[PDB]
């Protein structure tokens, strides 16, 4: 999986409270709409695990702003549970089609606070997803 | 505390009464060969390789008389899978390389180790490619077949071992539509050693340095179009192997049943990849089964395995011998 | 005659040590089988490419190697005339050179 | 005397107690074994002088380890006396033939503690060693 | 390993108490400084073994003198333990870089005294040392 | 605050105009000359220069009618000597150097001046270079003739210093066999002005701008082959010198005993090196009795410290 280091935000951020990503992506325009390249997508990988007091959930969500100051959600995942965040779980959020300057990634954490677990968010084209599909399944 | 590493004054370490040692005995290079055997085709998507694969058949129906039946729809999912780039620079302070004029001789002796280091890494990663942990690497042969529950789980053959001292053998078919590597638009595969020439460096303070540098791109991905064409022979407890196909796990049936697992070896070309430790016990086990049969006095050594079943059986070192048993 | 001996890389040299000579029997039975101890030795060399390999054994071993080879083939196909067996020449083929100047009762290496 | 920025260890350490060196050289292998190089050799320079309560000696000695933690001496000099350590006195230790990863330089100070004296250790090829030799000595 | 019959000292000496070498090398000059040959080196080879009540160590050390009267260390090893002195162990001392006339070998035996063990000390140019090196080491 | 650049500024670039550019007259720079006089041979070891020096001779025998004499052995110690390298870069904002089309004449003037500064640092490091202090730089003449106890101590003549205000005079003979400088194998002898490319440079912000750059390697060491051809006349207390060679320390006899001291100015070429102050009181002294002092040229050297600590 190729990654652009510049489109990388949250390099390996330790998500404990419901906090935002470290870096905020700045496009060189008011309406990048790079959701429109029909190719870009946010990926959040997980390490090491959704360790928590539990039961907790982590909602990954992309946010836009006009300026780097006040954000609002443009895509969201849903309450992905702890123990669905084993080391190695690509949560893909497709890039929203109407992007504005300054995209960020927020982590909506359901109580209690996550105690250990990093996540790395990046815009790629595109993910490595080739899971095996059944064949017979009578044989087998 | 501990100081290092670009290329510490151990050019001294490579010379005689004289210039850089040409006849250096290449120790840590191993002769694994998927890299020679592997097929390379440009990947089709933007930096991934899409592949449409049939997911559901129309079934048809037995139809009772006078009754207009449902139309069917053949459902079909497609999968895309990515590449990764593996590349490195190779810098030396120009002052260190220049002395005794072994500037070129050095660049060279260092280079041989780089080619070998890349093949070493590329093949070690083609088998243990975790794109789920390393993110940056393309995903290889494990854990595409890992848990026995996975849809290609029938294709991994449990050798029946247990504990950490146990390998797996691979059986694949390299060909356009069953398994291949993929390289980008428009970077070519594989390993490109471009020589950057002399250029300035930076002392960690800022305090100027000056040197040579060499690049080594080699960016591959890996289509596994369908897992039906790849079968893994897991938990081969290597301590328990005996030449008498006796205690522990036999290779020859565990190997042919892997051959029967492939739906028709038609295209492109099959290959077994076994750890060298396995290849040795294989040679011995074969001659021992044939020994109770018909082997001549002179063919007592046993021809080294070449074509197991008319499938080249390739030695690959960059393949772990103490692998965790696959639950 | 002044010589020393470079072993450039040990990868090209294999030792089959601690071969108990009293326990060797012709029926590859008690003690250590030679034909496998020897084939595994052959597999241990990373591609015998250059220059040329060679086996070196005490004549005692050469004799038991011979007896054991005709004995392993006996369970397959050995002819009336080749009952004694062709004298060992090339094992792999790799030449098998007799060396007298090779100690027979050497202390065990562990 | 040409010097590797990295093979410099203990830059000018004001060795007062019988202490070890500031920096520990980490070679990148289990066995750098750079004594076989027949070229590398440690040099310890002295400045300004080993002034102490006296009479004191500093036994310079190199140490190996498997890991950067527990050392054992692999070569040593002997009790080099004070006033044999004026500013400008290289005590050269030829490099031990059987090195491990992580080499360092220890300054074994016999009592009393040194009051002044830095020592500079670095691995070089090779030492600048030119002691003057007699002439006749009859003439004159 | 080529040997000059004259630099040979301690041919097969049974070092039992902490003693000096039998023979003393007399170079024909006040300061041979034979470390500068960067080629000469002391070797102490071992036979048959360091049997002692144990556990004992043998710290081999080279000594110079101005005249053949009092010796002083100019090189040392460190406490090489017993069970590292099996028949066949070259303990190499690189030649001290600053030698004087009359060099000898001292065997500083840490207690208790050795019960059996011969040693061969001689200056050679240079040693036979071919340590085994790794293979992969992944296979196998 | 204050603007303190390293690179050339349009102020500095505007002063070697005009509309004429070359011939810059260098008033304040040292004019020492060992550098002209020194010989160079490529060093033979790896960044050292082994030199075998005869340590003990075979003496002959008279052999009498019918009587076999016993055989002799020529003892030898060898003594290796190191080098050190002195590199500097010389960079310019490219638009600035290129402008009015004087790229080469500029590169040159900065070159002529880098050479001059490197001459000074190397010639000062040649007389007082310790490998024990400077660590990275090579060792030269001090403290090779330092303590009087040293076996070449007969070669240093104390003028009688006591105070810190005291110079020293040197006498050498540069030659292939007896004291010469060495440069590594195989980087070329002497100062190398290798001039690299445009390459992008970096503004402190990042606002990068393209520029020139020049390297200036020059790596020498100093084999002192045998000290016997070199004499230091240390401790010439300069507070005491007068033109009337009466008070203070006389130079002319002091100097000729320095000459009378070396076997045998045959090859290559001898020279005195003394601070301009010293060359001054020396010549004033000589005229009171009344290029080349006495069969050897005397080279006054500015880059030779006037107040160095006295030797014991």
Author numbering:
A (entry chain I), D (entry chain M), E (entry chain L): 1 to 140
B (entry chain F): 5 to 331
C (entry chain A): 222 to 331
F (entry chain G): 5 to 294, 310 to 331
Per the authors:
It infects and kills Bordetella species that cause whooping cough in humans and respiratory diseases in other mammals. In this study, we report the three-dimensional (3D) structure of the BPP-1 head at ∼3.5 Å resolution determined by single-particle cryoEM and derived an atomic model.
Arranged on a T = 7 icosahedral shell, MCP and CP each have seven copies or conformers in each asymmetric unit. CP forms dimers bound to the underlying MCP shell at local and icosahedral twofold axes, making the maximum diameter of the BPP-1 (670 Å) bigger than that of the HK97 capsid (659 Å). CP contains two β-sheets each consisting of four anti-parallel strands, and a ∼36-Å long extension (Thr125 to Ala140) with the C-terminus exposed on the external surface. In BPP-1, CP subunits form a dimer through β-sheet augmentation between the F-strands of two CHEF sheets, forming an 8 stranded β-sheet visible on the external surface. Although little sequence identity (CLUSTALW score = 5) was detected between BPP-1 MCP and HK97 gp5 proteins with ClustalW, the overall architecture of the MCP resembles that of HK97 gp5, with an axial (A) domain, a peripheral (P) domain and an extended loop (E-loop). The orders of these three structural elements in BPP-1 and HK97 are N-β-α (‘BPP topology’), N-α-β (‘HK97 topology’), respectively.
